[PDB]
Symmetry: D2
Subunit: 115 residues, 4 copies
């Protein structure tokens, strides 16, 4: 698992469950091309998005569908989505965890890059 996503809900102090995540790779013509997607699990986690063979160096965007999440909980949110854009590298450590903490009018995102 080269690329994992974990989402927390700062209002409820819980994993953010069933949040849609879409990942895009930047194409030579500078458009965003769908790459991977899924929904966070009961633990707020999304694994198995890609494989080591497919996850080549490149610029990637992870789009977290936060608006839909809040709407489903009946809470009025500010953002359309959270949007994490980064270069995936071959000589940084190998596993990328994109973590995201969600509030209605705020979010943070952290990259955890390890062996």
């Amino acid at each position: 698992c080269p690329l994992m996503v974990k989402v927390l809900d700062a209002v409820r102090g819980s994993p953010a469950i069933n949040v849609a995540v879409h990942v895009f790779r930047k194409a030579a013509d500078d458009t965003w091309e769908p790459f991977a997607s899924g929904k966070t699990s009961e633990s707020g986690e999304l694994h198995g998005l890609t494989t080591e063979e497919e996850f080549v160096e490149g610029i990637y965007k992870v789009e977290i569908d936060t608006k839909s999440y809040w709407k489903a909980l009946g809470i009025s949110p500010f953002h359309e989505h959270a949007e994490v854009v980064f270069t995936a590298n071959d000589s940084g450590p190998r596993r990328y965890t994109i973590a995201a903490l969600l509030s209605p009018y705020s979010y943070s995102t952290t990259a955890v890059v390890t062996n």
Copy 2:
């Protein structure tokens, strides 16, 4: 001033100065059109991006050029930029402050929305 941006640097405990910021508005045809741009001042603030008249309802993208900023300080950051996407003025005119806190491998962004 209906749209302002304030950036702090979490490594130095200071405003983040000279941070480039590009603002886009989603057009009818669903492309991002350039809307406004600027750079944060020595107080880490960016004012005067737009006017009440020009800042109509729509979906806006505020792109904070975090990688350029860290690289100018000799840090290799994780993110290309922070991307703040939101609907604005759907319930009438509001004033928005987009606040961002920057670390090399992390950032947060908070919106303060007030009714003038």
Copy 3:
């Protein structure tokens, strides 16, 4: 103003108004002595806690009464308060802004330290 506090509410996208704040200073005998206190205004800011003269070198604790704040809004938060502990003025007089961002189960705090 050498010590100021600014609080935002991450649920409402607004300044956090009427947030109680208590400041302590570690005494020679290692107890926390009361130093200053106040409440954030409608802009979520708290000024005038202390003076340049009284704000000497030492270890300070800024206690932001987050539980009282959320409870007054009918939210049951996780934390009793946010506790910001730091050495101040060890390299001469500085000006400190303690910024805090509040969610019911999360908070962050950032220091902006400038040399006047």
Copy 4:
């Protein structure tokens, strides 16, 4: 494991390793009484601080020794420590994870309360 701590380093995008953590319980006389302590592991995690039988309802303080961490990395930090104070409850979900993200002049902390 009723109480776990996980610490991340926002400068390096890594677990914060070997960070001392001291936990205190508030006594009837309102002083803080040592309760548990340890150092984060290679994954930035600290488990086995307490047991379900010992972790009674009460006010607890988790003190994260952030100053020492930064000092060891040669980076000048603002805080003496990060300080997470909370009431432990019997009818909230059972497992508490105190998460903390560290920067030299900033930190955030999040409570993840689950089954």
